[model samples]
Target: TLPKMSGGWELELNGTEAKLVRKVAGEKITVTFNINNTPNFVVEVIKNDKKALVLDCHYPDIFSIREVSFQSTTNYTLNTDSLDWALYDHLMDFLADRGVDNTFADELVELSTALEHQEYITFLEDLKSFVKS
Candidate 1:
């Protein structure tokens, strides 16, 4: 069985990315990350079918702000090195308020681990079958 995620988060597993989605206060919050690099994830908030904010967060607690654009084009991202500590603290607090804190990060890692392990075993089994045929 897969690890359960708290805060009513729903998990969607894929070959390329794993997604956690939930709705809070009429807003849609989505957290997406690749299983290969579970520490890094992107959190996006949508309101009224519009992109509200996007954050590039490193698990266990580092976060950086990404551009909020509807287009899939490249945009400038502020480097965390130039950001003030106070602002970073506020940003962490902002995510914590929305239930994306250390606890959630830990849970996400656990879920990713289990999912990847299952995928690995499945791949090995399929490979064995392919070789036999």
Candidate 2:
């Protein structure tokens, strides 16, 4: 589960070319937005160790991306830029292939399995949390 009392962010999907402009906190995480495009944006602080951001056409009112998560461990030390096209493409395919609702889903098994083999599955949980609304 994601943390409470935390902030959130969202951004529009722009394949691998999306660039985020973030306001540096006095030190911690601050404000951030996509600079190269217009898209949904949502951001949340998870366990104080990770930040969960959701991007689409309306931040939390529009399209909800279903991938991108942070492990509770060391990946935190690395940059979390958009580098996984595998999961992104698969989400598009999964919805199109099965006619699933773009805004939601009632299943997790399929997503879990698909995410396992996804080359960008490193952030699966974060991505799923993004779709939580």
Candidate 3:
């Protein structure tokens, strides 16, 4: 059982560089909690009072996810936005992790940093529409 602490509400993981504990307002109701711990990850669950699951990965790019989730699906679809530097890196990293044999993602990264900010934006716009989500 995950211990209940009267001091506060919290979520925690006990091992590795990423291990963390975060405090919540007061308390939460979970009659039963199942916690699994290991070097790679920790997963915890409270089956009702509304429920859950979680995953922790050492390198996010190593576990790349391409499909976007939305309220409508099977009959619908979604997309990724490439405006933010972080999102740009994430898209590139996803391809990199897969050994995708394309120089464009790497070359894009190099050009983005090499050029002035607006120049990169213009470069993208000149080829195709580029906008934020």
Candidate 4:
């Protein structure tokens, strides 16, 4: 808050560079974490005030998010031989909730679910490869 050297944790993500600058006032605690997921992406969680967390989407114009009321992180992962059609069902549920009828996307997801249930490893691998690259 004072100055870059006065010490504070800050993250700046812009254009082709994403940096995580963490330090405390005058302590021996300074670190810079540099990496990126997209050429232009915002991936920093910062402090809202003296307390409270804020989401920073740094880009053309900088700003802080203060009144975020809802957020959800999904952990629906398909593992080997895990017959959890519920995961696929959730996909369909999300699609239908978004007013999308039984379209190709829904059908393909269902078909994938069926293949997963039947343990069609080759088909699954083919789908995985298709998505991977």
Judging by lDDT against the true structure, name the best candidate. Answer: 1
Q: Name every residue pair that clashes in candidate 3.
A: none
lDDT of the structure predicted as candidate 3: 0.32
How do the residues 1-133 of candidate 4 rate in per-residue lDDT, one tens digit apiece? 2113212334353432434344323222112222322012222223322221112222221221112221232223332124355753553353233322234223323333443344455557879999995
**TM-score of candidate 2 on Cα atoms, chains taken together:** 0.21
Q: Judged by lDDT relative to the true structure, which candidate is superior, 1 or 3?
A: 1
Better model by TM-score: candidate 2 vs candidate 4: 2
Writing each residue's lDDT as its tens digit, candidate 2 over 14-126 gives: 43232222223322222222322233332322233334432221223124453343433233322223547686666445333322234322222233233234425545667
Distance (Å) between predicted and true CA of 52, model 2?
Answer: 6.5
Considering only N, C-alpha and C atoms within 3 Å, which residue pairs clash in candidate 4? none
Q: Residue 47's C-alpha lDDT in candidate 1?
A: 69
Per-candidate TM-score against the hidden true structure: 0.83, 0.21, 0.20, 0.18
Poorest stretch of ten by lDDT in candidate 1: 64-73
lDDT tens per residue, model 3, 26-118: 322211121222123222222223333222222133332233332211423333342465864664554333332134223323332333344
Those runs of model 1 whose alpha carbons end farther than 4 Å from true positions after fitting are: 60-73
Q: Candidate 1, residue 64: CA error in Å? A: 7.4
Q: Report the candidate with higher lDDT, 1 versus 2.
A: 1
**What local lDDT does model 1 show for residue 21?**
92
What TM-score number comes out for model 1?
Answer: 0.83
